[PDB]
Amino acid sequence: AAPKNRRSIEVNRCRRRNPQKLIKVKNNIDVCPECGHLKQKHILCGYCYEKVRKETAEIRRQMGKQEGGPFRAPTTETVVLYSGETPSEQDQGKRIIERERKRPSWFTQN
């Protein structure tokens, strides 16, 4: 179908400035207690998850460095230690992931 008359700018303003087509405000914005950045209340902090993701990428790269095959997987459990740490007696019998940087404040020993 073809339009019969040109829509005027008054009707166009009424259509395009109507509150259902406007961007609604978000009231769930909160400050992160750890880093002081911004996050939503039901969503993890992007800054903290970027830290966790980069450390996870470093761990995964260094454990892929130790194993030279794509089809070889560990039979036993994996533990990770940083510089200046030794494997515990309960951690023996598990494969060892050594990293040169110091252990983070957020990451515990366990």
Partner 1 sequence: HGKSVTWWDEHLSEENVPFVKQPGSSRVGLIALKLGMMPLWTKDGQKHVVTLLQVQDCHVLKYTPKENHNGRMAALTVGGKTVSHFHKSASILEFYQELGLPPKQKVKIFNVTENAVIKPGTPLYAAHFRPGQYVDVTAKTIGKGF
Partner 2 sequence: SEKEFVEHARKAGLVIPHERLERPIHLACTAGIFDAYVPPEGDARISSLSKEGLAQRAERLKKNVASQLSIRKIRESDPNFKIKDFPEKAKDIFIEAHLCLNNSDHDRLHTLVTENCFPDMVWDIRYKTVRWSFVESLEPPQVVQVRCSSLMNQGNIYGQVTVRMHTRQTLAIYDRFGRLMYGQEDVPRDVLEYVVFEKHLVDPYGSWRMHGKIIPPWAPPKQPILKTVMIPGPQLKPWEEFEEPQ
Partner 3 sequence: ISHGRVFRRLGLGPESRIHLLQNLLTGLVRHERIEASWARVDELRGYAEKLIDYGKLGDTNERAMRMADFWLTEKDLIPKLFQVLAPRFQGQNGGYTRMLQIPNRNEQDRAKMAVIEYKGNCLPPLPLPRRDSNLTLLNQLLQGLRQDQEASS
In the complex, minimum distance from the CB of residue 33 to partner 1, in angstroms, rounded to a whole number: 14
Compute the Cα dihedral for 102, 105, 107, 110 and give only its sign. positive
105 interface partner picked from partner 2, partner 1, partner 3, none, CB below 5 to 8 A per type: partner 2
- Which of partner 2, Zn ion, partner 1, none does 64 bind, CB closer than 5 to 8 A by kind? none
Distance CA 45, CA 31 (A): 9
Tokens standing for residue 75: 């039979």
Residues in contact with partner 2 by CB under 8 A are 47, 50-51, 54-55, 104-105
- The span from the CA of 78 to the CA of 58, in Å, is 15
The verdict on 30 binding partner 1 (CB under 8 A) reads: yes
The position carrying tokens 């990451």 is 107
Tell whether residue 50 is a contact of partner 1 (CB under 8 A): no
